Design a protein around this ligand. Structure first.
Ligand SMILES: Nc1ncnc2c1ncn2[C@@H]1O[C@H](COP(=O)(O)OP(=O)(O)O)[C@@H](O)[C@H]1O
Lengths: 60, 185
């Protein structure tokens, strides 16, 4: 019985492992979305900051 | 391209020349006072910006930012003997009749892409003001779209009704040869 019990127990544990992998990759997706939006925001903010600092430069 | 080698970056290809052109269009500006700007860049590091080549490999440049377009005002940096653009503008003015140069002093129109550096109008006005008499009103006219001024003016011209007789028709060419162009028009 050892054969089949290892078989089905490891199979259901492999199912749990693949579900954990799907959860992990969805976490990767959401983290990547946050990363991309935040880096785009950082880009816009930085370029605007540069425009404004050089504008103060010229103005003074 | 030549001044960036003293920081370690080496661009020799034509593609790399395009990369350096992009660096020039994005990071370079004209310093209102070159000497104290140089001393400031030497003292702090607040002028250093970073640029990312199209394979990663960020590069950071310091006083090159304003040493590149400074050549327009000191063409001796590239071994040329001419004078800066401010001085040739002033000379062209002082070569005109004394009655029109007061109205020329106040209508310096800037055009083309190389006049798009941040702070070029201020430096130009400072230099010409230092050269001209202390009574004239120096006005540098720098539109925000001066990179396409030639094309805009060309469309305005080609749209005028009184211009439709200034074309060089095919028949005039067939009569006169290619020399028609400068000989009459
Ligand atoms: N924003 C900018 N800042 C500095 N230099 C610029 C900028 N845009 C374009 N240039 C420079 O202008 C040149 C192209 O200008 P342009 O007026 O189109 O020349 P041309 O009329 O001869 O084609 C390029 O060599 C580039 O180095």
């Amino acid at each position: 019985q050892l054969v089949e019990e290892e078989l089905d127990r490891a199979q259901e544990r492999l199912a749990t492992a693949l579900q954990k992998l799907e959860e992990a990759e969805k976490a990767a997706d959401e983290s990547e979305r946050g990363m991309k939006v935040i880096e785009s925001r950082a880009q816009k903010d930085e370029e605007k900051m540069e425009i404004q600092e050089i504008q103060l430069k010229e103005a003074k | 391209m030549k001044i960036l080698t003293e920081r370690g970056y080496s661009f020799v290809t034509t593609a790399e020349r395009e990369i350096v052109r992009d660096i020039k269009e994005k990071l370079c500006y004209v310093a209102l006072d070159f000497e104290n700007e140089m001393a400031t860049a030497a003292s702090s590091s607040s002028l250093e910006k970073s640029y990312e080549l199209p394979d990663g490999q960020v590069i950071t440049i310091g006083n090159e930012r304003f040493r590149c377009p400074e050549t327009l005002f000191q063409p001796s940096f590239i071994g040329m003997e001419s004078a800066g653009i401010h001085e040739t503008t002033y000379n062209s003015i002082m070569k005109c009749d004394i009655d029109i140069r007061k109205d020329l002093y106040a209508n310096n129109v800037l055009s083309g892409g190389t006049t798009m550096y941040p702070g070029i109008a201020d430096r130009m006005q400072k230099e010409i003001t230092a050269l001209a008499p202390s009574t004239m009103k120096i006005k540098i006219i720098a539109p925000p779209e001066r990179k396409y001024s030639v094309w805009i003016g060309g469309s305005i011209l080609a749209s005028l009704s009184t211009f439709q007789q200034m074309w060089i028709s095919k028949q005039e060419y067939d009569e006169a040869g290619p020399s028609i162009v400068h000989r009459k028009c």
